[PDB]
Amino acid sequence: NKKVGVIFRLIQLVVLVYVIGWVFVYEKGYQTSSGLISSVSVKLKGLAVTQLQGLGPQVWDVADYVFPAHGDSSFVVMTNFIMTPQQAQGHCAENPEGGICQDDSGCTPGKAERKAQGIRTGNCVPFNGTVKTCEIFGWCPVEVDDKIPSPALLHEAENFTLFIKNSISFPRFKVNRRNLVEEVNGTYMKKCLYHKILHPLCPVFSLGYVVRESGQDFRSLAEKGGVVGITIDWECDLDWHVRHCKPIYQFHGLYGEKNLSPGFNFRFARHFVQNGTNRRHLFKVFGIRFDILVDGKAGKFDIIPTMTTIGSGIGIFGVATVLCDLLLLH
Amino acid sequence: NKKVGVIFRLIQLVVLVYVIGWVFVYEKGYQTSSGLISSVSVKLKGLAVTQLQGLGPQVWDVADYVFPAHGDSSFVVMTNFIMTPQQAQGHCAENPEGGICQDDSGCTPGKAERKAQGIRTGNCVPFNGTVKTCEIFGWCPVEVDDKIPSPALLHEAENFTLFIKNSISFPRFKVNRRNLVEEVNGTYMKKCLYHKILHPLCPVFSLGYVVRESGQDFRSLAEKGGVVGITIDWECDLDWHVRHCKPIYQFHGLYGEKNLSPGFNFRFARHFVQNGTNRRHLFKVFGIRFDILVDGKAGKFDIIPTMTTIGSGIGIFGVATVLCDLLLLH
Amino acid sequence: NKKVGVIFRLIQLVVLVYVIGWVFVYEKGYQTSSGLISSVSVKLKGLAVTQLQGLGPQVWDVADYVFPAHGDSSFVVMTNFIMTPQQAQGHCAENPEGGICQDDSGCTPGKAERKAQGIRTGNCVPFNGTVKTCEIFGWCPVEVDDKIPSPALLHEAENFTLFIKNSISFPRFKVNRRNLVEEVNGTYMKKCLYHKILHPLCPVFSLGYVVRESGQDFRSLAEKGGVVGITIDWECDLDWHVRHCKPIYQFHGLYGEKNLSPGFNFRFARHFVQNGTNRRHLFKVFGIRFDILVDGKAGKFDIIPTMTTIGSGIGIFGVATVLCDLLLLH
Ligand SMILES: Nc1ncnc2c1ncn2[C@@H]1O[C@H](COP(=O)(O)OP(=O)(O)OP(=O)(O)O)[C@@H](O)[C@H]1O
Ligand SMILES: Nc1ncnc2c1ncn2[C@@H]1O[C@H](COP(=O)(O)OP(=O)(O)OP(=O)(O)O)[C@@H](O)[C@H]1O
Ligand SMILES: Nc1ncnc2c1ncn2[C@@H]1O[C@H](COP(=O)(O)OP(=O)(O)OP(=O)(O)O)[C@@H](O)[C@H]1O
Ligand SMILES: *[C@@H]1O[C@H](CO)[C@@H](O)[C@H](O)[C@H]1NC(C)=O
Ligand SMILES: *[C@@H]1O[C@H](CO)[C@@H](O)[C@H](O)[C@H]1NC(C)=O
Ligand SMILES: *[C@@H]1O[C@H](CO)[C@@H](O)[C@H](O)[C@H]1NC(C)=O
Ligand SMILES: *[C@@H]1O[C@H](CO)[C@@H](O)[C@H](O)[C@H]1NC(C)=O
Ligand SMILES: *[C@@H]1O[C@H](CO)[C@@H](O)[C@H](O)[C@H]1NC(C)=O
Ligand SMILES: *[C@@H]1O[C@H](CO)[C@@H](O)[C@H](O)[C@H]1NC(C)=O
Ligand SMILES: *[C@@H]1O[C@H](CO)[C@@H](O)[C@H](O)[C@H]1NC(C)=O
Ligand SMILES: *[C@@H]1O[C@H](CO)[C@@H](O)[C@H](O)[C@H]1NC(C)=O
Ligand SMILES: [Ca+2]
Ligand SMILES: [Ca+2]
Ligand SMILES: [Mg+2]
Ligand SMILES: [Mg+2]
Ligand SMILES: [Mg+2]
Numbered sequence: 006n007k008k009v010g011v012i013f014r015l016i017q018l019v020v021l022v023y024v025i026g027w028v029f030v031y032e033k034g035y036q037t038s039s040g041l042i043s044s045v046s047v048k049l050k051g052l053a054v055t056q057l058q059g060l061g062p063q064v065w066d067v068a069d070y071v072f073p074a075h076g077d078s079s080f081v082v083m084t085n086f087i088m089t090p091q092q093a094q095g096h097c098a099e100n101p102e103g104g105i106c107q108d109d110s111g112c113t114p115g116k117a118e119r120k121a122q123g124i125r126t127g128n129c130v131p132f133n134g135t136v137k138t139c140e141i142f143g144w145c146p147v148e149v150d151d152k153i154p155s156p157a158l159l160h161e162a163e164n165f166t167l168f169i170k171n172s173i174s175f176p177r178f179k180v181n182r183r184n185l186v187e188e189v190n191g192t193y194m195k196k197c198l199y200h201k202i203l204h205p206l207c208p209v210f211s212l213g214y215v216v217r218e219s220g221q222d223f224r225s226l227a228e229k230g231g232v233v234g235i236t237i238d239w240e241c242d243l244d245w246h247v248r249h250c251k252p253i254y255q256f257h258g259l260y261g262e263k264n265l266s267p268g269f270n271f272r273f274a275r276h277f278v279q280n281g282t283n284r285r286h287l288f289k290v291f292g293i294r295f296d297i298l299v300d301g302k303a304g305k306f307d308i309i310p311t312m313t314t315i316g317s318g319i320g321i322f323g324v325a326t327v328l329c330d331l332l333l334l335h
Numbered sequence: 336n337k338k339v340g341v342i343f344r345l346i347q348l349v350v351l352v353y354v355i356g357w358v359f360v361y362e363k364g365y366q367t368s369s370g371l372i373s374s375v376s377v378k379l380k381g382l383a384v385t386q387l388q389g390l391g392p393q394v395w396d397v398a399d400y401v402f403p404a405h406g407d408s409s410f411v412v413m414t415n416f417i418m419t420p421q422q423a424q425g426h427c428a429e430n431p432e433g434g435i436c437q438d439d440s441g442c443t444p445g446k447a448e449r450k451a452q453g454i455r456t457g458n459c460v461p462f463n464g465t466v467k468t469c470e471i472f473g474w475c476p477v478e479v480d481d482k483i484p485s486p487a488l489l490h491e492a493e494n495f496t497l498f499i500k501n502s503i504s505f506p507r508f509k510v511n512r513r514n515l516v517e518e519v520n521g522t523y524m525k526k527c528l529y530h531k532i533l534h535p536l537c538p539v540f541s542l543g544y545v546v547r548e549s550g551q552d553f554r555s556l557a558e559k560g561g562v563v564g565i566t567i568d569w570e571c572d573l574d575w576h577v578r579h580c581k582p583i584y585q586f587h588g589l590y591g592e593k594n595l596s597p598g599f600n601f602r603f604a605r606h607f608v609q610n611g612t613n614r615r616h617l618f619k620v621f622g623i624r625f626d627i628l629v630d631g632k633a634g635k636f637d638i639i640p641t642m643t644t645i646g647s648g649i650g651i652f653g654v655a656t657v658l659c660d661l662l663l664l665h
Numbered sequence: 666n667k668k669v670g671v672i673f674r675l676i677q678l679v680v681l682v683y684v685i686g687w688v689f690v691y692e693k694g695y696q697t698s699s700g701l702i703s704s705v706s707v708k709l710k711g712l713a714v715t716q717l718q719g720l721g722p723q724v725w726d727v728a729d730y731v732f733p734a735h736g737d738s739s740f741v742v743m744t745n746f747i748m749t750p751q752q753a754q755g756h757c758a759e760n761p762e763g764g765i766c767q768d769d770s771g772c773t774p775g776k777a778e779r780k781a782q783g784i785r786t787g788n789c790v791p792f793n794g795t796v797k798t799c800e801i802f803g804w805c806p807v808e809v810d811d812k813i814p815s816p817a818l819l820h821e822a823e824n825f826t827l828f829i830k831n832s833i834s835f836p837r838f839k840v841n842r843r844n845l846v847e848e849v850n851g852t853y854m855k856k857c858l859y860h861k862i863l864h865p866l867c868p869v870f871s872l873g874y875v876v877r878e879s880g881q882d883f884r885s886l887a888e889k890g891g892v893v894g895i896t897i898d899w900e901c902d903l904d905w906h907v908r909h910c911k912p913i914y915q916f917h918g919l920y921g922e923k924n925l926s927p928g929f930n931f932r933f934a935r936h937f938v939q940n941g942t943n944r945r946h947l948f949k950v951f952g953i954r955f956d957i958l959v960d961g962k963a964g965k966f967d968i969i970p971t972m973t974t975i976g977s978g979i980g981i982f983g984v985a986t987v988l989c990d991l992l993l994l995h
Contacts, residue, residue: 042894042896042917042919042956042958043894043919043956044739044892044894044919044954044956046892046929046931046954048930048931050779050780050781051781052776052777052781052782052783052784052803054784054802061754062754062802063754064754064783064802064803064804066803066804066932066934067932068932068933068934068945068947069934072404072405073405073407074732074931074932074933075732075733075739075740075741075931075933076741076929076931076954077407077737077739078739079374079405079407079408080405081405081406094391094392094393094394116382116491118494119496119525119526120380120496121380121381121382122382123382123394124382124384142384142392142394143382143394143396144394144396161776164778166779166780170926170929172892172919172920172921173919174894174917174918174919176896176915176917181918181919181920181921183921183922185921185922185925185926189925190925191924191925194925194926232374232376232502234372234374234504236372236506255506257372257504257506258504258511259372259373259374259502259503259504259511260502260511261500261502261511261513261515262513262515264521265515265519265520265521265524266500266515269376269406269500271378271404271405271406272396272397272398272404273398273404274396274398274399275936276605276607277607277936277937277938278607278608278609278614278937278938279938279941280941281609281610284938287398294374294376294405294406296374298372320981320984320988323984323988323991324650324653324654324984325650327653327657327987327991328649328650328653328654331653331656331657402734402735403735403737407737409704409735409737409738410735411735424721424722424723424724446712446821448824449710449826449856450710450711450826451710451711451712452712453712453724454712454714472714472722472724473712473724473726474724474726562704562706562832564702564704564834566702566836585836587702587834587836588834588841589702589704589832589833589834589841590832590841591830591832591841591843591845592843592845594851595845595849595850595851595854596830596845599706599830601706601708601734601735601736602727602728602734603728603734604726604728604729606935606937607937608937608938608939611939617728624704624706624735626702626704628702654980654983654984657983657987658979658980658983661983661986661987
């Protein structure tokens with residue numbers, strides 16, 4: 006029958022054009038794939054001045070709000086903090102969150118099993134006029150974290166400019182590429198701000214723009230902390246010129262339900278010696294967690310993958326043909 | 336022949352059941368898989384008081400033993416340390432390990448080729464009553480680490496509550512998930528401790544439990560340090576509800592031969608200015624290394640993978656047909 | 666025809682030898698592969714003394730030039746720095762590169778839009794005898810990074826030694842391996858310098874050797890910074906003894922155009938309280954970025970992969986035979 010042969014030839018032509026357009030053209034089967042070796046360096050330029058009650062104006066610079074000063078990929082930018090100054094190890098009332106005592110017999114000497122704040126001395130001392138807390142041995146000023154300033158202490162963090170420098174190299178092809186691609190110039194790096202459409206190649210990122218692109222409001226996130234994931238994808242083709250290869254930036258927002266564990270926070274201390282006594286300043290920093298992830302591959306023409314793809318296509322064709330023949334026979 | 340046809344039909348039904356079951360349900364071929372983007376946030380609540388001979392009581396809060404303050408995925412929990420206080424730059428004798436001199440002519444001015452402790456002035460000074468070491472220009476006094484305390488200075492950290500906050504997002508499906516799940520609530524985290532069977536979803540991990548579940552003993556590991564690897568694996572079947580998505584926590588113990596470089600250790604310093612002179616405190620910290628590795632995939636029903644799996648199954652059936660026909664013919 | 670049968674048997678023998686040798690031995694189809702869990706700990710030893718104008722001799726020990734105390738995979742080794750001692754908050758002139766005014770009416774009170782150095786007060790005080798800049802609120806000694814010392818302040822960094830301790834474990838096969846191998850002993854590490862041929866397995870890497878093997882000159886890197894990538898690769902056939910399992914160390918040079926953003930740099934501050942006044946020392950450190958990446962796979966004989974490979978080979982054979990038969994059939 007003529008129509009049977011027509012259907013067979015149509016099926017073989019379909020599978021042939023499918024394999025040819027997909028394995029070779031679409032999926033780049035004639036190009037080897039390798040993995041980039043990458044290193045990310047980050048620099049933040051911004052300044053914010055905080056004026057808390059009872060304290061002088063505090064100037065925060067790049068060394069201050071960037072705790073991973075060595076330019077790590079996973080860095081935290083300080084946006085809100087609680088400062089407990091002049092902490093010294095001595096005996097005083099603990100925080101009321103741990104426990105509340107009405108008499109000295111209630112307190113027991115030892116360490117708390119859950120959320121230990123210090124070594125209990127077994128004495129109940131008044132934390133303030135109303136309630137009393139068991140006396141512990143720990144840094145004496147105990148941070149009350151219950152009050153979270155509604156206006157962010159560093160609401161200026163939104164405009165802080167952020168520069169990301171990424172250098173990727175493929176080992177098998179011995180090709181090195183950097184984010185600061187050709188189009189970028191020193192003059193450009195002075196007056197550009199990153200945008201999804203306007204300035205895709207500008208390496209200077211605005212913190213507020215990055216947060217808003219992820220899908221989070223900067224103010225509410227800075228009030229309680231947050232996590233933002235920036236991914237740099239280097240899809241590269243070596244058959245073309247290296248100028249074509251460029252870094253694509255994608256912003257991903259990592260969030261969670263606000264009732265439980267809202268935002269991101271950590272505690273850090275600055276140890277110093279004043280008047281011959283060792284003292285420290287405890288800070289509970291509510292900041293936005295920025296993670297840089299670089300994943301990419303390079304493709305360059307090679308003879309062995311081309312021959313293997315040709316053989317696989319011939320095998321798939323010769324199969325499809327025998328399968329169609331057996332189907333038409335039965 | 337009847338028996339030949341029966342064997343042929345049996346082989347056909349067997350390969351049909353195989354291609355309809357294995358690649359579809361077991362391998363989830365109709366689903367497509369996307370790697371997660373994740374961020375690790377770790378908070379350790381605990382307090383340990385270390386009493387050292389010649390020094391006052393030392394309180395080590397969360398910021399102290401957790402050296403990475405920004406909540407990095409790889410963090411070290413301090414278990415034992417060697418403290419050398421009041422280090423100042425000057426000319427003081429070197430450690431006996433570097434060299435032993437009996438006369439001033441033996442010492443050579445310059446810097447030692449390997450593991451230099453300072454700039455040798457060229458004079459042999461008595462390090463102590465018995466042996467003499469060449470004078471060097473370095474921090475004073477030089478740290479001595481020949482003796483490691485057999486009882487861990489921080490042994491209370493066996494009980495330290497470790498809270499891991501891991502937020503994942505799949506870019507292909509645009510679904511954000513966190514280690515905290517609907518089953519876990521605010522009242523649950525107050526008293527729960529992670530267990531392999533009892534509390535698999537509790538985000539609070541005990542350090543001793545993590546060490547014991549990794550095939551290591553905390554008591555022996557705390558003396559010289561160690562490396563414990565925690566892997567959080569997410570397997571998600573987006574065909575079901577998102578409540579079924581639950582993280583899987585696996586603890587892997589990374590250990591080596593005790594004879595050659597046992598445990599993990601590092602040295603850090605705190606710089607301060609006392610009495611108009613720059614001084615520092617050098618600590619040789621023996622701590623357990625914790626690495627959080629999050630690797631997972633999610634699968635949702637899609638039309639193109641389903642069609643590809645159907646085509647692959649039909650192709651496998653076709654050849655299982657002829658392979659059987661050619662064998663029965665022989 | 667006899668020639669047709671000879672050609673058929675020749676093609677049969679060719680495809681049989683192929684499916685018996687290539688996929689089995691070269692591809693290790695009978696073995697299974699699993700990803701390892703790796704944690705890297707780095708330790709450096711070396712001392713460098715920097716003598717500056719006015720300031721006394723400064724000793725930079727391991728804790729100084731190694732900014733990551735814990736020793737993460739990504740660490741920076743200080744080679745050159747710019748120190749602005751005794752930075753105290755107050756009113757001072759901004760940097761001349763920021764802005765220059767001839768009259769006080771030029772500057773406007775507020776915060777700069779880009780790269781803010783402080784809060785302008787609307788007054789112009791002379792930065793030096795020639796030009797005058799806007800008066801800002803912040804650290805009084807402004808850091809001037811126009812002059813970079815051509816001789817590296819820490820050129821002694823080239824010969825500093827680097828010890829890398831990596832422990833890898835395959836969870837599927839429950840086998841733990843370390844960079845320290847049976848060939849390496851305690852007396853060997855005392856004097857081993859890593860080399861590609863002479864000493865392949867020693868974990869003591871010379872910084873200058875690592876920089877030179879990556880393809881970069883240390884002296885140029887020392888002045889303005891650099892990036893060096895070290896990759897450890899483990900390929901182990903668990904069918905043989907575990908002694909054969911040895912890591913492979915490869916150095917990759919990550920560099921970019923020197924005209925735009927040459928080298929790697931960052932700023933960190935040391936906060937201290939002297940004379941009841943909070944001051945800091947700001948250092949602009951030019952250092953070489955070192956990144957450690959570990960990847961590997963292991964192979965163990967298993968029954969299911971062997972059976973799957975045998976089935977795939979039989980299928981490829983059965984197809985090749987008939988495809989050849991159709992070829993002759995024409
Ligand atoms: N976060 C940022 N925002 C805006 N511009 C930046 C940022 N980081 C770097 N740049 C600009 O990019 C150029 C090249 O960066 P490079 O690493 O040389 O910084 P730098 O010149 O050492 O820093 P500085 O400008 O503080 O001296 C610099 O001229 C700098 O002005
Ligand atoms: N390591 C830990 N051990 C025990 N409980 C913890 C731990 N980390 C967090 N929690 C509990 O989880 C709850 C939510 O924590 P969240 O991430 O909101 O930090 P936080 O409440 O701002 O910090 P803090 O508890 O210091 O106020 C807290 O009420 C706390 O009691
Ligand atoms: N960067 C390095 N260069 C040369 N030798 C090193 C280096 N790091 C460690 N070693 C040597 O390797 C041996 C085993 O390493 P290990 O991790 O036990 O160091 P350690 O003995 O704790 O350090 P230290 O020698 O400061 O006590 C040590 O005897 C040490 O001398
Ligand atoms: C005392 O502290 C407790 C802490 O919960 C608080 O509720 C109470 O209002 C305080 N009382 C005064 C008078 O400040
Ligand atoms: C950021 O700068 C813009 C002007 O470009 C200003 O309107 C905005 O208030 C600034 N951000 C904050 C919240 O300080
Ligand atoms: C600077 O880079 C931009 C990139 O958009 C380019 O358009 C411009 O021509 C460059 N400047 C010079 C002087 O080449
Ligand atoms: C002196 O120091 C050396 C260091 O190895 C030690 O062996 C010796 O016992 C010490 N002698 C005294 C009297 O402390
Ligand atoms: C808290 O979570 C636990 C999970 O084990 C659950 O059993 C309990 O009902 C929850 N509490 C409330 C009030 O729902
Ligand atoms: C003053 O500072 C400017 C800053 O660029 C410099 O160009 C100039 O040479 C300096 N003048 C003197 C006398 O130091
Ligand atoms: C490093 O090389 C040799 C040791 O091999 C040493 O003598 C020389 O002084 C050093 N040079 C530098 C640049 O530190
Ligand atoms: C130390 O290791 C080296 C490896 O090159 C080996 O040749 C030597 O025999 C070892 N020393 C001892 C005492 O076994
Ligand atoms: Ca890291
Ligand atoms: Ca101080
Ligand atoms: Mg609280
Ligand atoms: Mg030692
Ligand atoms: Mg500059």
